[PDB]
Design an enzyme around this catalytic site. Sequence first.
Site, mmCIF file in Angstrom:
data_model
loop_
_atom_site.group_PDB
_atom_site.id
_atom_site.type_symbol
_atom_site.label_atom_id
_atom_site.label_comp_id
_atom_site.label_asym_id
_atom_site.label_seq_id
_atom_site.Cartn_x
_atom_site.Cartn_y
_atom_site.Cartn_z
ATOM 1 N N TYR C 136 0.832 -1.194 0.000
ATOM 2 C CA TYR C 136 0.000 0.000 0.000
ATOM 3 C C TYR C 136 0.873 1.253 0.000
ATOM 4 O O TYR C 136 0.594 2.209 -0.715
ATOM 5 C CB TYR C 136 -0.924 0.023 1.218
ATOM 6 C CG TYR C 136 -1.738 1.293 1.313
ATOM 7 C CD1 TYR C 136 -2.765 1.550 0.407
ATOM 8 C CD2 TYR C 136 -1.450 2.262 2.272
ATOM 9 C CE1 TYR C 136 -3.480 2.738 0.449
ATOM 10 C CE2 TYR C 136 -2.164 3.461 2.322
ATOM 11 C CZ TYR C 136 -3.176 3.689 1.403
ATOM 12 O OH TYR C 136 -3.880 4.871 1.414
ATOM 13 N N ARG C 183 2.079 8.376 12.905
ATOM 14 C CA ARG C 183 1.798 9.642 13.574
ATOM 15 C C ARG C 183 0.332 10.080 13.554
ATOM 16 O O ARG C 183 -0.154 10.666 14.520
ATOM 17 C CB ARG C 183 2.657 10.747 12.953
ATOM 18 C CG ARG C 183 2.347 12.149 13.455
ATOM 19 C CD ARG C 183 2.787 13.184 12.431
ATOM 20 N NE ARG C 183 2.078 13.000 11.164
ATOM 21 C CZ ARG C 183 2.290 13.719 10.067
ATOM 22 N NH1 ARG C 183 3.203 14.679 10.069
ATOM 23 N NH2 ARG C 183 1.590 13.476 8.966
ATOM 24 N N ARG C 193 -10.821 6.126 8.759
ATOM 25 C CA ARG C 193 -9.797 5.494 7.933
ATOM 26 C C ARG C 193 -8.849 4.671 8.798
ATOM 27 O O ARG C 193 -8.452 5.104 9.880
ATOM 28 C CB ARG C 193 -9.002 6.561 7.179
ATOM 29 C CG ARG C 193 -9.857 7.473 6.312
ATOM 30 C CD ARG C 193 -9.004 8.521 5.613
ATOM 31 N NE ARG C 193 -8.311 9.384 6.567
ATOM 32 C CZ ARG C 193 -8.910 10.292 7.333
ATOM 33 N NH1 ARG C 193 -10.222 10.469 7.258
ATOM 34 N NH2 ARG C 193 -8.195 11.020 8.181
ATOM 35 N N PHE C 253 15.887 18.998 -0.957
ATOM 36 C CA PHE C 253 14.549 18.472 -1.234
ATOM 37 C C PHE C 253 14.336 17.060 -0.686
ATOM 38 O O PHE C 253 13.294 16.767 -0.101
ATOM 39 C CB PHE C 253 14.292 18.460 -2.750
ATOM 40 C CG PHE C 253 13.011 17.766 -3.141
ATOM 41 C CD1 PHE C 253 11.782 18.379 -2.950
ATOM 42 C CD2 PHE C 253 13.040 16.475 -3.663
ATOM 43 C CE1 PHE C 253 10.592 17.719 -3.268
ATOM 44 C CE2 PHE C 253 11.858 15.804 -3.984
ATOM 45 C CZ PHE C 253 10.632 16.426 -3.785
#
Lengths: 334, 334, 334, 334, 334, 334
Positions: C136, C183, C193, C253
């Site tokens: 997933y 978290r 969910r 980044f």
Amino acid sequence: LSSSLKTCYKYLNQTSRSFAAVIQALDGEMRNAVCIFYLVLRALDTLEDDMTISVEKKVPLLHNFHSFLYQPDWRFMESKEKDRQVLEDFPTISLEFRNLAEKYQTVIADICRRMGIGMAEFLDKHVTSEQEWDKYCHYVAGLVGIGLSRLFSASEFEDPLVGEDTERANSMGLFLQKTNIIRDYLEDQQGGREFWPQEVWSRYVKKLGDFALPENIDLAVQCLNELITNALHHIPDVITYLSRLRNQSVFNFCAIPQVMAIATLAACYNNQQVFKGAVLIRLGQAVTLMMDATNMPAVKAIIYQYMEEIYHRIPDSNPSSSKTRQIISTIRTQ
Amino acid sequence: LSSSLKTCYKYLNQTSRSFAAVIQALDGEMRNAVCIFYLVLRALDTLEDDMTISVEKKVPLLHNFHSFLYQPDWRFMESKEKDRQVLEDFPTISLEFRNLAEKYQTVIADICRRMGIGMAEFLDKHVTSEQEWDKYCHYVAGLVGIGLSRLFSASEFEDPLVGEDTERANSMGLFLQKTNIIRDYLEDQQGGREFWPQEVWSRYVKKLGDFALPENIDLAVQCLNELITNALHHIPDVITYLSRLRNQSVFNFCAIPQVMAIATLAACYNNQQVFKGAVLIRLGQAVTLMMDATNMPAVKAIIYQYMEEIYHRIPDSNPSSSKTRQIISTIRTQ
Amino acid sequence: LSSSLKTCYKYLNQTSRSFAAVIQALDGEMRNAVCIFYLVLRALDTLEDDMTISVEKKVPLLHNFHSFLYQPDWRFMESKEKDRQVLEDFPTISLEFRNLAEKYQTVIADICRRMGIGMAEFLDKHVTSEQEWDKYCHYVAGLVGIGLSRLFSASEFEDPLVGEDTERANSMGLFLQKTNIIRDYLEDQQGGREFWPQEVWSRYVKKLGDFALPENIDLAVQCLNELITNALHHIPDVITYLSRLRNQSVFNFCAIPQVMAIATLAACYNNQQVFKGAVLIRLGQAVTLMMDATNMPAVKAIIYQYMEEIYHRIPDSNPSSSKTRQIISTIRTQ
Amino acid sequence: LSSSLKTCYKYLNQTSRSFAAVIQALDGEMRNAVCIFYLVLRALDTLEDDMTISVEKKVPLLHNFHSFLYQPDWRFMESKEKDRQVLEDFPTISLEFRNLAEKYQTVIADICRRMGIGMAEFLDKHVTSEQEWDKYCHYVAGLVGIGLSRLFSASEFEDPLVGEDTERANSMGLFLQKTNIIRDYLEDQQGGREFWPQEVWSRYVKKLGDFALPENIDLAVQCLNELITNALHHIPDVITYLSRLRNQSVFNFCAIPQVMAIATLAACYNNQQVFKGAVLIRLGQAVTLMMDATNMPAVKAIIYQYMEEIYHRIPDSNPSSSKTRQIISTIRTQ
Amino acid sequence: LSSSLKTCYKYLNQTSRSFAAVIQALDGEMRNAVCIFYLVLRALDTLEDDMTISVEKKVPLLHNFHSFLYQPDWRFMESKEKDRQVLEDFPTISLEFRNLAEKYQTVIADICRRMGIGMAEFLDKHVTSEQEWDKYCHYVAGLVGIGLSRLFSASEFEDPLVGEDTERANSMGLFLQKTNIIRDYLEDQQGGREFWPQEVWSRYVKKLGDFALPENIDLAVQCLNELITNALHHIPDVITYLSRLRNQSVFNFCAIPQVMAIATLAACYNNQQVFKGAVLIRLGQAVTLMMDATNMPAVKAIIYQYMEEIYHRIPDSNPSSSKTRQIISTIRTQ
Amino acid sequence: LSSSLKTCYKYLNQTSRSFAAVIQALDGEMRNAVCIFYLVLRALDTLEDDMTISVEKKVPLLHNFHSFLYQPDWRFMESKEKDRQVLEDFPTISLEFRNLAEKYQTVIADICRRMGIGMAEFLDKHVTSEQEWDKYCHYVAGLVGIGLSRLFSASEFEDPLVGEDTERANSMGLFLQKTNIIRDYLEDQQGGREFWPQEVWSRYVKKLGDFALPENIDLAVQCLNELITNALHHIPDVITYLSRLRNQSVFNFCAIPQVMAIATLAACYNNQQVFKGAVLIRLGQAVTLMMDATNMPAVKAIIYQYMEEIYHRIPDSNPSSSKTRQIISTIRTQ
Ligand SMILES: CCCCCCCCCC[n+]1ccn(CC(P(=O)([O-])O)P(=O)(O)O)c1
């Protein structure tokens, strides 16, 4: 070694809270060159600030200051300003100036000559239009950016392209100066000095001093927001200027102050406190607390974070709202 | 891979609050060399620390420690100190020591030998003169700097000059040790140890412990300032040393602690809090909040900034005021 | 120039609190490519989130999303999700997508295709096994890392190897996704969910929601630690990936989010607060506050520090305690 | 990947002997941009060249050529020129033009619009004055230099000043064109086209075609020498331009043609062969035979050597002799 | 600008066929400094050349030449040499010399002094021993390499070590001078000048001029080979020197001449032409035809190929065969 | 110093016609490391080439060659091959090998082993399929490239990413080997050795030697083109591999051989001369005669020029024509 050079660095630290450290961290010959440049500029600025010196006595001092650099015994003992010592012990400073390689002397003297003419020009008048604002800022800060850029190149630590790009270098100075003028409204007001462009503040109040009256706070912030929006237009040039740099010590010197001015504008935007007292510069979001301003990509991100700090607070009702979003949009997208 | 090497890295993280992270981040061969070096020194330091080990047993242990590195089964099981684990399982650590390239072994053993001899010498005395203070710090920290430097050069990640210039390497250690000794005055006093040079404090009080007496705060601070003024003299060497480094991993390892010590001394300067508890390692001004200690230029600027923080607080009545201004002035001008 | 590109960056800042800044700081072509990539992914992510869109209606939208990028007029007006703006003004986004060089379009379109397939797959099932958790996460994050990596290589700003090593790139995504899932337990619960792998939380309670119950707080933290222990296994790959980067803008980044994730795990480890509210991500030790996450050695140090921050809080009693210690040991010794 | 881009590069190689290689060698984005820019300019040049098209039909085509870039189906099937393939399959070229970043599109379109206007303008006239010669060269070459410089800057591979200083960019173009016009005298006469400034050649003969006359060879050489001396005036600018470059691929692309142009001029200088047939470009002195034109200093050295090759052969009797010596002295001393 | 400087560069291109180009390509201040330096050395060398100048009238001119640099009006009008122009218009040269930064003047003046001394010393003798050959070469070329090196360091375009290692710099001059002395035997013999060391040539013939007699061609070539072998010993130092350069313009200036010297020696080795006429400097193998002398690795490759060109032509019966092989072996292996 | 090392460099020059100069030009430890690596490789290859050695005697020599490096006294005095000296004096070589840092030894040892194994395998068979051709080349050239790449990274003059990329390092090797095999057909036939993939030449003639027959020249050329087309497929990898390099000495070493091979293939393409005699390698157009192969953009330009030289001569009547154009168009568009 040199006792006079020691004295100069002592003065540098006495008169510069926010530049001394980065100046002293500059590579090789740039160190002394920029230190001396800071001190003579400090002296010229003190002369301009001293209102105890009549205009007719001040014009010649400003016009001929560049020549004093070559008069070993020249000094000024009648200043009542706080940084007066660089004027009273100018011989020690001009002495070290004359010790600098000629290529540096040429640049420093040239800037002083032009700055003197510029400062003398605005002694009897207030800044009216925004164009006049750029002109004034060009005279007291823009030329500093140009001068510094030329010193960087003449030293060879930076590419010749840096000193050649006077437009962008001017922008670097314009940005810091406008930010300081905006931040120091109350201070300058209480001091009899007016720097906010008249064609801007006259659309809000009758007298610049009115922004000091609590009953005019709303109009004051609106004007503040318009001026801040004006200053933001220099950021694209600032980023372009910093992107060209290749020397680390020079990059730190130029970048840190630009980033601090940006943090300053962010804290002042739509902030009533600008007219009530001093404003607290808060450190930043989470991503900022992970980087510092010592590499270009990091500097961009820190700037972008501050831009959103502003963008987020733009009131639909502010008469400059669209302009503010527009310039921030341009900065983001470039 | 190796479980013993893993165990070593486990002990490093357990016994090194502030060096573990940077050590583990060192490039190639330096990583293990420095890890093990840190482990044996910590083990040696623990032996010296343990007051339950009689002088009779301690002297032989410190003198012969370096040779235990070669004896596969040597270990000590009578320590009561918190880090005794590195001693009880010394075979695991000594085993990894013998796996290091011969060249690193020479440096590590040599430093342990000289350090042990040095620690033995101070088991029956206190630090008296400032000269003895340098000697003591040399044995417990200076040599550590020399050792690390020689390792850096041996590995070739750094220039030969780094390991050769033992004076500069020594200063790096002396500055950290003196800073820590100044900071921990109260913690050490309550611990039964005296590290402040007797020839300096005896000129203020009769017993070192007198500084903890609320009625002596003023003299205590005057002594504090004098010693800090002594420590500042190592900065030119610290700057020289750091400016020669070329490896980023090594630069971070060396610079971070130095800047920390410097901010620490700045926070302690003319601060009475040193004699009442722990002292705040502030945060900095604006110029520093935008810089981290990862490039030489930035480090210089941060160091210069902390120097001014101290210079701004120098009281004219302080008997060391002139000396303090003097050394700072030299650091600025170099 | 293009006002549509400006709108895209407006959307980037409206939908991404923590990536916008570093994305805008990306060099040359990577800037717009990553910006647009972020926006299409966000649109796809929003369709996926919308529970008002039935599964029968939703599946075809996810499967064909990659093809909508080439339908100039396509948009979706029936979403009630927060970021629906990107779906309603999708033509503006796909217009700029089609302006990107073809080599970038191919990468983005391929990732969108495969992601929609995966997302569709999980609309009717929860995560059961840990292997299903990786699948997933691979679908909603792992593929993003692979996509970005392929953009870096195709742009030539990074080595061809960055894009080719799909495994290391995948781990980058998995680590961030797992960290967030861990978290956001409570926020997801109150949202209906469920993302914690069933096979794991079922060994602690009957319904994942029970962890929200004050009486199960002990079993909760135990599950929390087991999942956190699972996430840590990606760190070696994270470090390998980051150490191959050569472009500074791409480094900032990639490194900053990974570091933030690690800080988050350290904060959540053995923390009951995860089940009561938001967790406070705090500063870091002393060695970290001196460095930022912009150079590889510094990032390693920062990581090693958080590892020890977890390590030394590991409760002997915890069912995962030995697993936790083992992976952290592997992270240090590599 | 895309066959249309593949096809474009196929055409780039069929239509360019001396540029295809260096163009394909350009870094990242500049590759396709310059490739396409070249193809469209070649297509425009082919229309202009075709004397098979009537003036009243050719003019509109040249004027609106820039607009075809945006018309997917536009194409010309009536040309008889050798490179007619780019006109017949223009849709392929325009498709790729439209695939370039917008910033490149506007530059290319803008230059094509301006070039067309100038080309149409010179259909019914010959070059009269020298000022007209610059104008003609501007339209067919200068603008290409300006267009390429804008592309370099927009790509960020080069400084913003490169695209800004249109004068220097223009000179790059004028130097190459004039050189080619000087060199191709005979070839052009035999083709019915006249490019030597009438106001110049008229002072020597009655009809430009007379230089082709053996009996007039001496007037010819003198006129040749005057024009070459005219061209040598762009060299200071050429050196200024090349000196600002920082990207190696761009440097190679720009410097190689300039150097070859200078070699050509040196060979043609005071050479009767110019009026008989093709002139061969020598080897160069010894100093040049150890240096290739890939770094500025080397290129300078190469240029200076060719200047001397010419300075050495200046006949006192030549009417331009003094002028020629002057420009060379200026080049040498700067 | 300055018409005097313009004149200086004209004379540079008049008196220097092989250094003019690379000197004019030098960066910043080294340009004028080196140009002037070349001119004054040229004047001093032309005085020393003029046989029309009696010994006791020449000796003074040589000793006090370094002082004429400061005598604004000094000039010599009685020279008949070809480069007499630089002595007659010396004030122009001297004027520009005084315009140079003193740090350069200091170096130049010191060299002209030590050179005139040595030159004077050899006016009445010939070169006897090989040690005396080195001494003579030190005076006319070695000192030049030292002076140029010291100019480079003072300009800081090069490290301080360049101007520091006088031995290496000396070797630079010695290699070039020996190569030229070897190459110009005939031309010099025909001029009445003898520079070959008597202790080497007297072992073959009674009078050095005998090498000009066809009957002694074989002996001449043997001596030729002995002197070349001698020269080759400077190569290790030449490579060391070049390898330390960092400024591209300085590298070209230094490497080109050295490579041409080595190529000249290779062409002259075991070559009868040396005594019959001039010697053509050869293309180079295939590997060399693929590189120029502008980067260190390439220069080394070129140098090694020329060594092999020599090594392969070494006659077993040649008197120096072993010496020659030895030095070339040393060079390959270092 | 070392006389055994000197002897090693004597063999390098003796056995290596082309590489010697560039190998001796390698930086630091790569120099000796690669010199020694070349010698052992040459010895190992000579054993393989010797047909006077029985297969059952040869096989074990090949398989164990890698162990001889550690057998001080090992040698082989029974070779008749021209380079036998490296085998007879192997102890001098194996000695210097064992003087190389352990890191270099591993690679060379590892390579020799795997190469010996592979050479043995092909002792009793011929190259059949093209997949086999790649396998063989892999064993006699590819592995060399993999080794060198690892030596580069191990030395730290080249990034770790170079050593890692084995597929591209292999391609480097495969391209040179295939090129030599294609060029040396005639010489290999008259030597009793066959290397052209049987599966390919079998579709043209019955026995590979038939190509040597003037009556099969057409089928020969066709087969030639099909092989050259085969080779060209490695160029993209070659270009990618070189683009990654950062060290100049390593670049010249890697780039030059690749350019020569490309030039070789270019000259051989559709050239009957291949089957008649030695093939000649031409100059290269105008643009290339301006650049050397010492910087990546220049190398690309050179390659692209040779690619055009082949594209120009592709006969529609060839049966590989479409494949040849297809590959060249890919090399250009990427
Ligand atoms: C990583 C860059 C180098 C990768 C390729 C290394 C192996 C090259 C294999 C081709 N090979 C076989 C024999 N030779 C010897 C060559 P040489 O030393 O110049 O005599 P050549 O006879 O000119 O072809 C070279």
